[PDB]
Each structure stands twice: as C-alpha cells, then as structure tokens.
Symmetry: C3
Subunit: 133 residues, 3 copies
C-alpha cells in the first residue's frame, strides 16, 4: 500500500551506530542516540507528507514470576545476558542476576508507604526511594 | 508587562552550545543539552518568582511533497544541507539526499501493520521497524 | 507488606554513579543518566510481576525575589559559586550572577505574548523564545 498515515512506534533498530558513523556524528551523541526509541507521526495527504519524529529514552521492562528463573538481556543498561531469579526473603523481593558481573542483582521492599530499591553490582550499591504517585 | 505567569513552551534556541561552552560545560553534556527543548512554568506573585524548567528531547520534523525537491537542513543529526527528493518506486517511498555524503537516503514501505525503514549512507545500512499505534 | 502494586515516583537516588561505573557504562551515558528521574510502575498479582521503568529529565527549579541577592551553586550547570541578583529594568527582568565568569547573567521579557530570554556569559549570548501555552 501507499498509505503511510499513522502513529508509528519503533520496535527494532539495527546498526544505528554504523549509520551515524557514516554521518560524522561524535561519540557522545552516538552513545546517547543508541539508547532512544522513536515514535514517528506521519500525516499524509496524497503526495503531501508531514512527518514528526519523536524521541524517548527507552524504558526498562521486566516481567517475572517469583522463583521462576528467566533469561534477561539488559538492553539500555550494559547490554549483558544474565540468568535472573527472584526470591522472597521475608517481604524483601531479592533478585540475583547470574552472569559476568559479581554480586549483581537488586532488592525491592516496602516500608511505610515508600518503595525501596537497592541496585547492586560488584562492590557498588545504589539506593533509591520512591513515593506513590 | 511585568506578569510572567504562565506555561512557556520553547519556540527557538540559538547559540545554546556557544553559551554552554563559555561556561566550561563538558563536551558530552553540551551535545545532550543541544538536543533538548524546554517548557518553563513561571509562578509570579508580585516580585516573588518560583520557576520550573522542564526538559524533553527536541523532535525532528520534515514536510515534503512526493516529486517536489526541497532543501533540507538536517538539524539534530550532522547539521548538513541536502537537496532531498522523495519519490515512488512501486509502493516503496524512496528518498535521495544529495549532498557531500552520497548514497545517502532512505527507503520506506508498509507490510501488514509494520512500517519498514532502511537508512543508508555510504556503505552503511540501518534497519528500523515500527508498529502502528 | 508484599503488595508492590502502584506507580512509584523517584524521591532520592544515591550512588547511581558508582553503580553504573561498576557496570562499565560509558562516560557520556553516565553524565546523562545522572540527570534523570524514574517512575517505576509495578503490576503485581500474587507472585506474578510486570514492571516498567520510565526515564524523564530532572526539572530545574529556581525561586527568587526581585532585589534580594542570594548565593547560588550552579547545579545542572557548571557548579561554580555565584552571587545572584534579579532586578527590574523597566519591564525587562535582569539577572546578574557575580563570579569568576564575566558578564554572566540573563535577561527575560515579554513582548506580545512570547517570552524572550537572553542568556549571557562573557561575550556569548544565547537567545531563546517561548510561546505561552
Ligand atoms: C521517515 C524518515 C525517518 C523516520 C528518519 C530520517 C532520519 C531520522 C532521525 C531522527 C532523529 C535522530 N536522532 C535524535 C538524535 C539523533 C536520528 C535520525 S528519522
Ligand atoms: C524493579 C526495577 C529495577 C530492579 C530496576 C533495575 C535497573 C533499573 C535501571 C534503569 C535504567 C538505568 N540506567 C540507564 C543507564 C543507567 C539503570 C538502572 S530499574
């Protein structure tokens, strides 16, 4: 068909870096641009096209069942493969991500009406606190 | 007027990078900051101001008519001028971007509820697929 | 509790830089990621979880009273110390930030119902226009 009207949300993006290299894009811009997805709005009249590309910093999705191991590729992080397992420890949700990196995983728990999140890798621990919106 | 109250959506931003360079902001940060737009919410009571600046990625717009060449400045890319032509090859939308870089352009086509996009420049090809939203 | 259901708005984020370095994330990416906040949406039915982390740019706040000097450590910028003063010059709001950089400040004014903002540092000017939304 020749009908390009619609709102189009990117689902895959292959060799974006090489293309950018051909245009003489600097390292920093390339290293950010590779972490984006795009939604593109095409408004087409006959042979008149108006198009708008929208850019966004690419979400981190992850689905799991507690105690069910699952493969995880950490796109938009460090692009690694890990074998993740989430367990209950009391009321703490604990995830170990087995792979190249040592001590890798995270912890989630509720205290009060705040969500606590510990991100761990190696000897580094990142602490995050969330309030319900 | 002395009333700045409102929600203010950026319309243009010139020499943002030169201003940032004068402040000694590192190259990486500036290359990001130039791809943002800003909405500034101003709450002004008398001489008391509270302001909040919001950041978003710019966007990339482009209008054309099939078979009507048009000069194109590729902002937020490699910032070049090209004489672009979007033409039909069957039901594939074909774009040639004449300029310093050559074999530069793209091919777009619909199959099912997917839009396919090949970006080519030099010997590099980038493949992107979009789902209709 | 074991009920993680909700939409969770980040309130604090400690040692995010160290964690990312432990993951070998490139310098450019780390300088961006430190300017983001996250909203984590958790959909949990028993031990089944779906989670989506969304990224958004940290807002940049500044409150002031015209004619009252105040010290400023420039946060999302170049982290220098400045003595800031906002004064009226007719209906042009004028701000001087005294410090190492010379001619550092900005000018903001409404003409029509667009907002004009001139940012200055040294001999460099950045001109920005906003429309009221
Ligand atoms: C149909 C033609 C399309 C979708 C495009 C041609 C070039 C595009 C583009 C838009 C934005 C970006 N980046 C944001 C920073 C780099 C790269 C390429 S879309
Ligand atoms: C339940 C949510 C969890 C465990 C999260 C784990 C890692 C997250 C994340 C998302 C993005 C980034 N950045 C991009 C570079 C840094 C780091 C960590 S959420």
């Amino acid at each position: 068909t020749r009908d390009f009207n619609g709102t189009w949300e990117m689902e895959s993006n292959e060799n974006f870096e090489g293309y950018m290299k051909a245009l003489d894009i600097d390292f920093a811009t390339r290293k950010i641009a590779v972490r984006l997805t795009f939604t593109d709005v095409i408004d087409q009249d006959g042979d008149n096209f108006k198009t708008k590309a929208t850019s966004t910093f690419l979400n981190y999705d992850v689905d799991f069942t507690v105690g069910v191991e699952f493969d995880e590729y950490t796109k938009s992080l460090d692009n690694r493969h890990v074998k993740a397992l989430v367990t209950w420890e009391g009321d703490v949700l604990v995830c170990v991500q087995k792979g190249e990196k040592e001590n890798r995983g995270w912890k989630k728990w509720i205290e009060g009406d705040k969500l606590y999140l510990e991100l761990t890798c190696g000897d580094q621990v990142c602490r995050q606190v969330f309030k319900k919106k």
